[PDB]
């Protein structure tokens, strides 16, 4: 008869150890026979300038395409022969390479990860092939409306800042990139203090640390000629970017306001508030009876095919808002209801919906951290951002501290009378002009 | 703790593993689906899957939705051709409320006329959303062409039946197919006695096997869609072994030998034999994998290919020839061992997550009654010999084949040509 608090107390605890070069080795141990071991690197588009933007995506593309120790086919053959799954993801702030593999295959997985991170061939012929592939993938990514509208949101919100740059980068940079630029990017951004080796599942922390000392030790944090990249705070600019393409079937609009950093304590109340706002898709079964007033009205009037609320957080700034896909003639109504919900949370939030939001947040936190891959991802990202893997008990305590007063305070600070950033795509003519959108951000009654 | 399996006198199977985790997942697995639909009531399974939130005798739609949302829970219905799974996930403290809601939904649905009529449009919305990916329609047509009976029924309601599903049909399907002998209540993070109590409380009624579907019969047909898409999705399959048989494990090893799914992102599928075999012939954007579907009555095995419309024939022919080469005995022991490792790792990774473990326990309970430990499954995988893989390939090559193709289809070969 374990209780939620008891279950949180019984969660295996992450042990963090640091190699002398600066690599941090972190592990959470479970009885599972499968383990996920990955290297999280604090490199991304936000650390890239204009000319070398997209070099991170190129390096990610060709990282699994060969090493000096084992040629291109050899790495894939080893990974598949041991049954492992090798995958990488690159974001504006983080780059990661993780291997899903059996626990008995941990040493070989660590070897392969070290080879990928350090001894990357970056061969020129493969460089040209990946150049072609990346241009094609940019053309494909043009089709994905959600990704485009979010890229527009980043471009307009963080204009003039490195965060505005896309992870993939402009096509001109892609075709102009060279082996020297990729090598320089690896030398500058892939450094031991900026890397975390994380594992989950059937992994012994001592064994993982010993394997790290065996393989990753050579990697160094010294910068050639003391050329040290310096982090830059990014300004948030309230702006509106509208790509009006009436041919598109449905209109995508993403509206956001500047949000807290990763380490700011206000993230938890804001996540509770967003959970109160909720998310809706046409395929949801709940429909009208769903608690979220925006979701209920959208289902009743068929306002939008889908609407979701996002809390994207970067080191010093973040995008807080929602993304909704709706018909051409329902954009104004949905925007009105979304801003009404924002102002209602800001001004007259109630205890009951706060309890619902807290419970939803608890369930999301516990459900997401399930499986070796998400647990390892959380470990690596938490070490890179928070400097520590916040234990689930700490998350529960912080959630429990949230009350209606806290939600009203934080929502008034971040959402009320604040200039928003709006990106629209498709038949967005009915989307209100920016003056109307800004006017909606405050209530004349309050 | 360890998984505890109990076969109740009414025939219900109750399983529980106390993982001592913050979240507890309870799932009722029922041996109903598209297979048990007859021609008259086609698509009733689809609406039943959608009608998980409609008013029940115990609770109204409003109460179910609001309560499940208030505790932060999730109610999910997962349907296969042979199975339907109702699962509730939430924090362990509030599992009782969601358990009551789940059993109210599963055992005492009202199917009020107005609510079903309102939900009938969600049939078309869901069908359109699912059919956005061509794979769904291609596999639906593949099952329709392969079998002339139960397994041919689509997981989505046919278009002519969108507004014609009646509440009486839903009640008949529930009464005759949602029965205690057909159900298994699987719980993660819930003690066995509590699950047993709830099962007695609600699942006592509607005992017995219920209506039994006819055995699926191989049809060996072809369905060609001609939807004008640039890339052509074509699947060529032949009849195979039923789930939980020695030849079924042989077919799984054969699927992994030929190539099932890339393990390295943006890789070349070097281990995958079909991939390289096609790649050498065709330099255009292409894809190929082995389709292994196993059901209780029978199974299908074959090749799924996605390629440029012009080059579809080359890709299909190359994959078929590679399977023929495997059948002729050109199979190395090392390839068999690597495929065995990949399959064992895939099984372990699938059961790693809570959802995967619950689904596996439910599937084993429904198909085979008892739960088999992962070690025994791995031992079964190891027991497969290379000769068995060769014989599975020979059976696929020799057996009558069914094909489904979608796209431009100008150069897509017919089954006779292949």
């Amino acid at each position: 008869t374990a209780t939620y608090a008891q279950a949180l107390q019984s969660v295996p605890e992450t042990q963090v150890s640091q190699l002398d070069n600066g690599l941090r080795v972190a592990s959470e141990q479970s009885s599972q026979p499968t383990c996920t071991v990955g290297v999280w690197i604090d490199a991304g588009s936000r650390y890239e300038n204009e000319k070398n933007n997209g070099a991170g995506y190129f390096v990610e593309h060709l990282a699994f395409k060969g090493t000096k120790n084992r040629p291109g086919s050899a790495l894939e053959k080893e990974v598949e022969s041991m049954g492992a799954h090798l995958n990488a993801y690159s974001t504006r702030e983080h780059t990661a390479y993780y291997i899903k593999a059996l626990s008995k295959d941990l040493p070989k997985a660590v070897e392969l990860l070290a080879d990928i991170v350090q001894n990357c061939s970056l061969e020129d012929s493969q460089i040209e092939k990946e150049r072609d592939v990346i241009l094609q993938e940019l053309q494909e990514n043009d089709s994905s409306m959600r990704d485009v509208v979010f890229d527009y949101l980043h471009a307009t919100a963080f204009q003039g800042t490195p965060l505005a740059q896309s992870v993939e980068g402009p096509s001109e940079n892609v075709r102009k990139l060279s082996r020297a630029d990729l090598t320089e990017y690896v030398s500058q951004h892939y450094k031991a203090p900026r890397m975390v080796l994380a594992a989950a599942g059937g992994v012994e922390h001592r064994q993982l640390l010993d394997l790290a000392q065996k393989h990753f030790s050579s990697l160094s944090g010294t910068y050639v000629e003391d050329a040290v990249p310096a982090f830059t705070p990014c300004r948030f600019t309230g702006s509106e970017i509208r790509h009006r393409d009436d041919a598109l079937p449905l209109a995508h609009v993403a509206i956001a306001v500047e949000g807290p950093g990763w380490a700011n304590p206000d993230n938890v109340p804001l996540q509770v508030a967003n959970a109160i706002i909720g998310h809706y898709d046409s395929t949801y079964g709940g429909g009208t009876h769903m608690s979220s007033t925006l979701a209920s009205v959208a289902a009743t009037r068929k306002l939008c095919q889908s609407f979701q609320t996002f809390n994207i957080c970067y080191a010093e700034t973040g995008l807080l808002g929602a993304h909704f896909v709706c018909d051409n003639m329902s954009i104004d109504d949905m925007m009105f209801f979304l801003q009404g919900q924002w102002m209602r949370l800001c001004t007259s939030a109630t205890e009951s919906e706060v309890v619902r939001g807290k419970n939803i947040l608890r369930n999301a936190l516990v459900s997401h951290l399930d499986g070796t891959t998400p647990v390892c991802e959380d470990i690596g990202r938490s070490l890179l951002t928070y400097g520590r893997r916040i234990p689930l008990a700490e998350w529960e305590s912080r959630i429990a501290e949230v009350d209606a007063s806290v939600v009203r305070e934080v929502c008034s600070k971040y959402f009320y009378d604040q200039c928003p950033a709006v990106a629209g795509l498709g038949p967005i003519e009915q989307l209100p002009d920016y003056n109307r959108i800004r006017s909606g951000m405050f209530w004349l009654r309050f | 703790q360890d998984l505890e399996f109990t076969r109740l006198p009414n025939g219900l199977v109750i399983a529980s593993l106390e993982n001592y985790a913050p979240a507890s997942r309870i799932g009722l697995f029922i041996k109903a689906g598209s297979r048990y639909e007859d021609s008259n009531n086609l698509g009733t399974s689809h609406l039943l899957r959608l009608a998980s939130s409609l008013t029940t005798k115990g609770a109204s739609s409003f109460k179910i939705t609001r309560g499940i949302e208030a505790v932060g829970g999730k109610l999910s219905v997962t349907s296969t051709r042979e199975s339907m799974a109702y699962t509730v996930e939430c924090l362990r403290d509030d599992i009782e409320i969601l358990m009551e809601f789940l059993l109210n939904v599963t055992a005492a649905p009202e199917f009020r006329r107005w609510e079903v009529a309102a939900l009938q449009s969600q049939l078309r919305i869901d069908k359109a959303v699912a059919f956005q990916n061509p794979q769904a329609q291609v596999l639906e047509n593949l099952h329709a062409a392969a079998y002339r009976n139960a397994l041919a029924n689509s997981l989505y309601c046919p278009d002519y039946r969108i507004g014609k599903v009646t509440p009486d049909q839903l009640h008949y399907y529930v009464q005759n197919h949602f029965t205690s002998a057909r159900m298994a209540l699987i719980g993660l993070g819930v003690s066995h006695p509590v699950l047993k109590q709830v099962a007695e409380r609600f699942l006592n009624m509607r005992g017995g096997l219920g209506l039994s579907g006819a055995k699926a019969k191989y049809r060996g047909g072809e369905i060609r869609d001609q939807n004008g898409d640039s890339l052509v999705h074509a699947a060529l399959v032949a009849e195979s072994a039923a789930t939980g048989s020695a030849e079924a494990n042989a077919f799984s090893v054969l699927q992994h030998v030929l190539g099932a799914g890339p393990h390295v992102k943006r890789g070349s599928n070097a281990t995958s034999s079909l991939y390289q075999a096609v790649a050498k012939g065709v330099h255009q954007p292409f894809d190929v994998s082995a389709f292994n579907a196993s059901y209780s009555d029978s199974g299908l095995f074959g090749i799924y290919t996605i390629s440029q419309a012009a080059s579809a024939g080359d890709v299909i022919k190359s994959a078929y020839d590679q399977v023929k080469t495997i059948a002729q005995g050109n199979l190395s022991n090392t390839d068999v061992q690597a495929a065995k490792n990949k399959l064992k790792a895939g099984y372990l990774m699938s059961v790693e997550s809570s959802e995967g473990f619950l689904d596996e326990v439910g599937s084993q309970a429904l198909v085979a009654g008892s739960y088999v430990q992962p070690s025994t499954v791995l031992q079964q995988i190891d027991s497969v010999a290379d000769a068995d893989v060769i014989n599975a390939a020979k059976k696929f090559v020799s057996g009558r084949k069914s094909m489904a193709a979608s796209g431009n289809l100008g150069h897509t070969p017919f089954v006779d040509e292949l």
Partner: peptide, 29 residues
């Protein structure tokens, strides 16, 4: 790759599962 044609949902998540159906490297190519 079954590619179970899942549907996004809360409090009602209809998921339907099919069998391995490829669509593995189409984006890559």
């Amino acid at each position: 790759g079954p590619f179970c044609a899942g549907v996004v949902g809360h409090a009602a998540l209809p998921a339907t599962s099919e069998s391995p159906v490829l669509d593995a490297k189409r984006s890559f190519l």
